[PDB]
């Protein structure tokens, strides 16, 4: 079914939510070095919470997709915005896609 | 289950539009450094009053994502509106997630 | 109950408005010294004035969040304006939550 | 009780609007020593005016929230501002605070 | 009564917009000294023709609000400006709150 | 009684309006000299139209007000726009004023 | 009658929005000597154009309040402005007091 | 009668519309002489094909108001633009004018 | 009749349409030799397409108003700009002349 | 008739929609010499396509007005410009011609 | 028929909305040899996956319509966007042209 | 047919949504090297997974118009902007190609 794909939506909204918002502050003004490592650990644990709530084949989708960073290297305010956006995309078009193909499913069953 | 997420929401409600206000506040001018060290501790103690209107699973959850500030060091601007906007994201996410979600099992058990 | 929360209401109105009116001033213009110290005692009798119209649970909430100004130094325009925006989203998440709480207890109980 | 808070209504709309004009000609343009001295004096009289017009009790909190000036210095522009921008803050949560505590009021006993 | 207070509404609502408008061509653009001169002349006969029309409770209030100038020194554009701010403030204020005032009377009287 | 005050109510609109449009006029741009003693003839001209127009209370009411220029001297930009802004929110004022006055007494007779 | 005021209606509206129209274009742009010279020759002219669609009883009011320009000299851009804007305004004014007035006696006439 | 002013509506319309048009050119940006000696010349042939369609008594108050361009003299941009305006205005104003005036007519043969 | 004076509407509309847009294209942005040379050949050859649509009536009175350009010198973009003005001023009167007179003759016939 | 003027509307929409869409193109930015060279290939290859797509009268017409480029010269963006906006004219005012002057004739076979 | 002149109406979309967000993409910012060089050879593949999707007839219509780019030359930004707005507006011409008609001819239909 | 070509629409929805924010976040702000060659290999991974969810024809139109990025070189702003942008105007393209498409399909076999 389409709608075992998304265990937790409550989380996955929860958690995403909260992606969303800090690269809308990263997007806001420049970052220092303190920040930029804190967000590091921040994606990284991000991404576990993520695949909590979600079913295992969106697991592995998401693990092809996305890369933990170096943790011997502060990655740049660019890298960050590129890692949270990745997430956000995927996290909006997850839900919008999911919710589009079930509402044509039904659509096709009416006839 | 669900709505036993939130102990208590007024309290969250409370306590989250605070955060959300400072961090306009921040992002509006340039703080200082007394400034910046009375924010690191509203902020050690927003954390603490929201844990006590949690579920303890949330709880856990906040823990593992959030990181209180050494407090031998007053944080910059940059990282105190990254501390602010991770709360703000994930508190708006979690209240919308769960009606959200909840909306979606009442839709259907209609069917 | 939750409407035993606020013990004063229009009180408390009252004193939010001052403050929040007061924090608009602060933005719009740089302050001086004796308006800074002005506006520090003001801050503290607004937080007495806030605790005298609220049940002895948030008093100590309150309290708990907030801190009077060191009487030996006038503080910053920053300082004054943090202190405020603590104040003014505390108290808009108050009510609102307590408001958006007491609506969901009714719906609740309408099934 | 309640709207026994405020014996003179119409007076206290009176004196309260004209510190409101005047608060937003202060923040126009900038001021010379004559206008501040006389805006200084104003302000004096008006809290007089505003005390005729108040309950006890709210006489008092009056008396309690404010400072009247030094009559041996002239007060700043800002100095100014904060002084009146406290009370049309407090005046307009005054009446707020009475309308939106009794609305409840009457909205609880129709259940 | 609260109706027996101005005594003269069309007058007073004459002399008020003349002052208003008098208050919106000074702002526009600066005063020389013979306009000056001359809009203290005014202002001195406006709070003559005001209290023509109001009730003596009135005129007493008006004349403890306000102070004719050194006829030995005319004034500047800002004490004109706060000069006349304050009588518009005040009149606007005195329509508003007896209307206001007297609407709540009537809606108690229902009832 | 109270349309017994403005005889000629047609004429004084049209000598208004003619005013009015005069003031707009010098706002937008510089005058010379042969353009202000043009319009100090014109001020003085008006104010006697007008004169033809009210009744007698009225005349006396502009004349304690207005002052005509001395002959001798070309007037200012400011103390023509000041002069002309005078009778234009007087003018205004005194119609309003009227029609207003006049709604609350039709409205009084009702109940 | 009010009405016998204006004795050719359509030929005063023609000469006056022509009036009104050339006082556009010398608002939008300086003009030269012979335009100055030519409009000094177009006012006069329309003055008397004016006079003939009007009752006598105006002509006389026309004629008190304007000038026309010494023929041995060419009148400023400023000049020229005032003259037609005194035009345009009286003219609106002549239209808008008839109807107005009218309108009124027509209101009073229904009681 | 009235109607009968306009001989040939659709001609003066058309003729209008184009001088009109030819304002709205001049305007918009710099012309060179050949740009003036041509419109020097579409104004005298205007005219004439504009009297055309006008009744004897029109011609003659066209006749009088304007004036033709001295051939031997390629005459300015804001002559030009004078010549055309007057004759816009007058032209819009004529037509408005006779629509005005018949309905005020028919309306008073109503009552 | 009115109607017999464009004998091929849709062609007249299809070569002011193209006038019109040429005109738009080059008051955008400033010509070179070889388009203002291209033009000019383009507005000769329009003034015939158009007379080809219309009565002789109207060929003889645009033959009347316009003028090709000299065979041998290249006008400027202000000379072609005032020449096709004068082309879509003339067109768009012409069609709305004739609605609205037709409009009107059957308004008065319907009486 | 009338219809029958476009033999392939579809067509000359898709080949006029195109000349368009350059049109737009060419005017956002400085083309380079490659650009232009092929611009006016596309350019004669367009006029060909359309011909296709029209009556006789239309492609004579059309032949009348346009005008193809030298082969051994690469035209001016201006130049461009002017070509394209003539085609893109005369087809708009072709089609709203022909539906304009269709509509014209079924709405007088109503009557 | 004129709509078997789209074999593949959905795979022509495709196409075409992906090269009308190239075109896009390429008016927003500078671009470089390498991305120059990869559009290039898009633009190649584009028009043959057009082909794939049409009739012969436009087939052919294309081919004499486009040009493939010399392969041992990498043609600017100018000659890229020239080459895209030329199939941008040719496809957008090509559908709205066939829709028009088809409705077109099926309002003829219904008389 | 023609919804047999997706065989995984939430799938492309997810992957397609989340390259056209990572277009966005591209567009918004310049790259650094390690931003880059984290994107080229998103890129790649995209694809891939975009693949997955199409039909054979697809895979191969996808094959056909693509290029990935040479391993041994990080791709520029530029390349990178251009080849995200050529997947979401093809992923737009082809569902909104296929909606109307069958659109059509539904509304031809009702009649």
Redesign the interface.
């Known amino acids: 079914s ?1 709608t075992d ?1 998304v265990e937790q ?14 690269l ?9 070095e ?2 930029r490592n ?2 590091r ?2 994606h990284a ?2 991404i576990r ?1 993520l695949e909590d709530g979600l079913a295992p084949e969106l697991r592995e ?1 998401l693990d ?2 996305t ?1 933990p960073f170096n943790e011997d290297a502060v ?2 305010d ?2 960050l ?3 949270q ?2 997430l ?3 996290l ?3 839900f ?3 919710q ?2 079930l509402f ?1 499913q039904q659509m096709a069953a009416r006839a």
Request: net charge negative; hydrophobic share 45%; glycine share 6%.
């Open positions: 389409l794909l939506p409550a989380k996955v909204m929860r958690i995403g939510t909260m992606i969303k918002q800090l809308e502050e990263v997007r806001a003004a420049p970052l220092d303190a920040s804190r967000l650990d921040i644990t991000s919470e989708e092809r997709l890369l990655p740049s660019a890298e915005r590129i890692a956006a990745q956000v995309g995927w909006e078009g997850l919008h896609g999911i589009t193909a044509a």
